[PDB]
Design a binder for this molecule. Structure first.
Ligand SMILES: *[C@@H]1O[C@H](CO)[C@@H](O)[C@H](O)[C@H]1O[C@H]1C[C@H]([NH3+])[C@@H](O)[C@H](C)O1
Ligand SMILES: *[C@H]1O[C@H](CO)[C@@H](O)[C@H](O)[C@@H]1O
Ligand SMILES: *[C@H]1C[C@H](N)[C@@H](OC)[C@H](C)O1
Length: 6
């Protein structure tokens, strides 16, 4: 449920 991009 978060996103990113790391
Ligand atoms: C991430 O969210 C964006 C904005 O809502 C979408 O436009 C994008 O298509 C999404 O990224 C894709 C590819 C990604 N690797 C995957 O984890 C997500 C679910 O869908
Ligand atoms: C990727 O990892 C970073 C570092 O722990 C988090 O901040 C992020 O929420 C995701 O898990
Ligand atoms: C999300 C966008 C970001 N610029 C990328 O780093 C190379 C990451 C892997 O995906």
């Amino acid at each position: 449920x978060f996103x990113x991009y790391x």
